[PDB]
Design a protein around this nucleic acid. Structure first.
Lengths: 374, 132, 189
RNA sequence: CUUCGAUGUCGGCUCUUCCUACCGUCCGCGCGCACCGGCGCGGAAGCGUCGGAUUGUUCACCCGUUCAAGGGAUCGUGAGCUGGGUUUAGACCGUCGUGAGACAGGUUAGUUUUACCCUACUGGCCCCGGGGCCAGAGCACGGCGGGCCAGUACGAGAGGAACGCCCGCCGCGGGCCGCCAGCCCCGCGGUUGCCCGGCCGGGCAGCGCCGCGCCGCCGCGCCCGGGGGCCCUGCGCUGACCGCCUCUAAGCGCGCACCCCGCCUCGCGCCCCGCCCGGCCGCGCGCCCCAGCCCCGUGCCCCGUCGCCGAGCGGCCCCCGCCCGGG
């Protein structure tokens, strides 16, 4: 029969299969295009998401010259060291690598990655490589092979977890493209000059641009269609219960279709939010990061109470307007956006929230609490 | 007039609201909301500053009863977030009778009136004694 | 090793299907330059019509429709083989299809099937579309790469040509009995 | 014709796909097309096709609104439901029959049983490093406005556009907690009966109840959705067959909410590095064009048949723990 009244499919078929992500941390799977002739930039950074804030801003779009409060998420970012250079050629088959020159000296956080348990491990990783390199005659010669045969150069870098409050104690290695540059050599030289050296969010991204947060979303376990896809609860008098999709198909096709609503794993799946602006790029060592000329006192990213379910962010922090995928401390990757909103508002922040997210706080800084309570 | 910024849709169809203007009547019952296209089952919902069709109730003035009229809700009980982040919730649900061209039937609007209604409908702004 | 520049996608797949089943094993190269007879718009819509055939219940159990041209030539040779039976499974495996001449099969001596070539088959003005162009409009995103590579290969083979005549002219110059018997002794071979 | 050792039978709800003989929006074209608006086409299924009064009602009709096409899937959909209806047994009423009873005449009352099997679908699992990349499969932004244009074109007036850019809303989709809602696992305060001899402080009434409430979900809150390619109907350009003409015949331009790819979700396998760096196997390249086809219409024709060294180019195997705590 014709359905009768008309309504749309509940759920996005392109976001199937809904399984816990096999990829441990978000893999970009894409990078902004090279545009040979642009300044040689870098296109990504890894950070552990902190907590949301709510900042006043001055809006100049067309509400012009008015002030609005909007949530911003602090993605704590540690300087991430660079460990290697990967040159992938663009052969018929796809991006195929032409070898990688890992660095001679690699730290414990990144060494921790290869072995599951460090204390009881062979600790043999890169024993021969360190020996064959070190002189650096070999490293250079192989970087030369990348320049001669490669078209896309990506610098593999490791985030130092000790600087973050994360409990991992092992670095999550990542690949960042060095896109831009007149030729492959300039990109290769840019990668060589950043090798075994900290890379900071300040260099990779800028305030006012939009970047895409990629990550793994929060998860709920098995959840029924009502809380997974969104189908309407059946009316109160239903035997076998109301929280379900009443018809899973029609006698033909006999097999149930893939487009039907089915109970499964809600959450913990890879998602890329897009076009989120960078309200603030700063280092928490400075004690006036939240101090604005319309603040008139001293504040910093750490909120009284601490980021709830998070640490201290005693490091560089990127504040991105809007919610990003992931619970606190989930690794959140960031890429230069691929196609941002054509007409966005300019960013001027006139006040940043610092009171305790824990409970309800009416005291922006620690000192005000002891003076108010006397 | 202008471009509406989304608020919280406080009042669904069947809501009875009080009448701010004198020439209107004590009960004004929502019947439909203007510019409403929704998915199935959604009861058309209106909010402060939208044009909603109202019917004067049995308690109301006999002359204006038994007809469907345009109206804009002035006071909405449900909390809504203005951009500056203030959430303002009015004490009671109420609305004014306006012709679609903005003509309020009553001589004066009585009771504090929402900022959102004033911007969208100009005449309400001139006749509102205590804008909040 | 049958090169497929100019060969009909149906007729090559008849010569090659008999060979695989006879048990010969062949490699097809330059596959994108093979021609599917007919006007491009109709040929493109016959494939963009085949790509609509898919199992409604799960497009994963559905017929797999392949966009890259090496597969388009081989799925055709799959119909002309008993793919399900073992003697067919051995022969489909015995076919290696390469879009463009890869370094894997480049040095191999190359033969072409003259009979199934569109030049010797289709009349002039029949209108023919290369599977490579159909591939790009059905969803192949690797077209430029296989043309950049093929140019660079045809360039190193142009330098080689100058080198090759030199080695084989010396061989011929040193012609110092089979030549006067195998093709010349009441044999004429 | 198939089913009567039984295919659950009406509609509704919930949900999924499909079809064009397309109502609105997309692209043209024709008007008895000045403008607004209407009306007729051809391509077109992408999206939208609502909220309600009566009725069991499919239908019908009316009232609204962003003004509201038609159908199909065992009259899709009962081990999904609901039983209002129909359709058992109780009971009326009207008519018909001498009567038992009848009624395609109305009225009320009247168990909706069973998956733990197999498929299918959805998620999950089967000890082996990290970092990537492809084949395949899913595939998502439409629609409505306000602003400037503009009171301009057009019009005798009356009325009254548009491309473009901006700003919003609706529908849906993916997220998130600060804000503000909602919630409270054992927190803090209040109180009521009883039991602890009274105070203090506790129990018991399946959390006795009440007032707030934290981490956390969550929504009613916020955040994000701006791109390419062939082309369809056609509109044209040069230019014929056919001393003209011409959109088409050879060409050639432009070109659709469609389509295909991107983004995006999944991803068998594969690549690189590390550990180790080991074995095995093969022996072989000019290109281009067919109305110049430049010498055509050959060659190989012996993968064991006596071939197998190497060199050099490919391949091919090749390799990597858990338990245990916490999230």
């Amino acid at each position: 029969s014709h359905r009768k009244f008309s309504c749309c499919r509940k759920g996005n078929l392109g976001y199937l299969p809904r399984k816990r992500c096999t990829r441990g941390r978000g893999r970009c799977k894409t990078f902004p295009p090279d545009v040979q002739g642009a300044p040689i930039h870098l296109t990504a950074f890894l950070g552990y998401k902190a907590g949301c804030t709510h900042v006043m801003r001055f809006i100049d779009h067309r509400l012009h010259n008015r002030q609005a409060i909007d949530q911003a998420t602090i993605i704590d970012a540690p300087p991430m060291i660079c460990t290697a250079i990967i040159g992938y050629a663009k052969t018929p088959k796809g991006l195929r690598a032409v070898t990688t020159v890992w660095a001679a000296h690699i730290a414990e956080p990144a060494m921790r990655r290869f072995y599951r348990n460090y204390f009881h491990a062979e600790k043999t990783a890169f024993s021969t490589y360190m020996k064959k390199a070190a002189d650096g005659t070999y490293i250079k010669e192989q970087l030369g092979r990348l320049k001669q045969h490669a078209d896309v150069i990506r610098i593999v870098a490791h985030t130092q977890p000790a600087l973050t409050p994360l409990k991992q104690k092992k670095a999550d290695i990542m690949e960042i493209q060095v896109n831009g540059g007149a030729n492959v050599a300039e990109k290769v030289d840019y990668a060589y000059a950043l090798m075994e050296k900290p890379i900071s969010i300040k260099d990779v991204f800028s305030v006012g641009a939009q970047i895409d947060t990629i990550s793994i979303t929060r998860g709920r376990g098995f959840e029924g269609v009502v809380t997974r896809w969104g189908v309407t609860r059946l009316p109160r008098k239903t035997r076998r219960g109301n929280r379900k999709v009443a018809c899973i198909g029609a006698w033909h096709p006999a097999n149930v279709q893939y487009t039907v609503a089915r109970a499964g794993q809600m959450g913990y799946f890879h998602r890329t939010d897009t076009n989120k602006q960078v309200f603030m790029i700063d280092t928490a060592e400075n004690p006036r990061c939240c101090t604005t000329e319309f603040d008139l006192t001293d504040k910093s990213i750490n909120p009284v109470g601490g980021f709830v379910n998070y640490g201290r962010v005693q490091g560089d922090f990127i504040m991105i307007k809007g919610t990003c995928p992931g619970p606190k401390r989930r690794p959140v990757v960031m890429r230069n956006a691929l196609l941002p909103h054509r007409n966005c508002p300019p960013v001027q922040l006139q006040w940043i929230s610092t009171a305790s997210k824990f409970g309800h706080g009416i005291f922006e800084t620690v000192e005000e609490r002891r003076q108010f309570y006397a | 007039i202008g471009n509406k910024f989304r608020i919280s849709c406080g009042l669904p169809v069947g809501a009875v609201i009080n009448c701010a203007d004198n020439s209107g009547a004590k009960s004004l019952n929502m019947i439909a909301v203007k510019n409403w296209k929704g998915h199935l089952n959604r009861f058309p919902k209106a909010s402060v500053g939208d044009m909603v069709l109202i019917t004067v109730g049995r308690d109301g003035k006999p002359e204006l009863r038994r007809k469907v009229t345009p109206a804009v809700v002035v006071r909405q009980r449900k909390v809504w977030r203005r951009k500056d982040g203030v959430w303002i919730y009015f004490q009671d649900n109420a609305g004014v009778i306006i012709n679609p061209k903005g003509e309020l039937k009553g001589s004066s609007i009585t009771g504090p009136v929402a900022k959102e209604a004033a911007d969208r409908w100009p005449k309400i702004s001139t006749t509102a004694e205590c804008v909040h | 090793v049958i090169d497929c520049k100019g060969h009909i996608l149906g007729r090559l797949s008849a010569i090659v299907a008999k060979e695989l089943l006879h048990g010969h094993e062949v490699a097809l190269v330059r596959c994108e330059k093979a021609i599917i007879s007919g006007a491009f718009r109709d040929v493109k819509a016959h494939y963009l019509k085949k790509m609509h055939k898919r199992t409604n219940f799960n497009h994963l159990r559905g017929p797999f429709h392949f966009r890259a041209p090496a597969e388009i030539v081989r799925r055709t040779i799959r119909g002309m083989i008993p793919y399900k039976t073992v003697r067919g499974s051995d022969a489909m495996s015995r076919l290696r299809v390469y879009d463009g001449i890869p370094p894997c099969c480049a040095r191999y001596k190359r033969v072409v099937c003259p009979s199934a070539m569109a030049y010797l088959c289709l009349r002039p003005e029949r209108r023919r579309c290369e599977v490579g162009r159909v591939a790009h409009e059905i969803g192949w995103q690797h077209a430029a790469d296989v043309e950049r590579y093929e140019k660079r290969r045809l360039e190193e083979c142009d330098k080689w040509y100058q080198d090759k005549i030199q080695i084989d002219k010396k061989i011929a110059e040193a012609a110092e009995l089979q030549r006067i018997n195998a093709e010349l002794a009441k044999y004429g071979y």
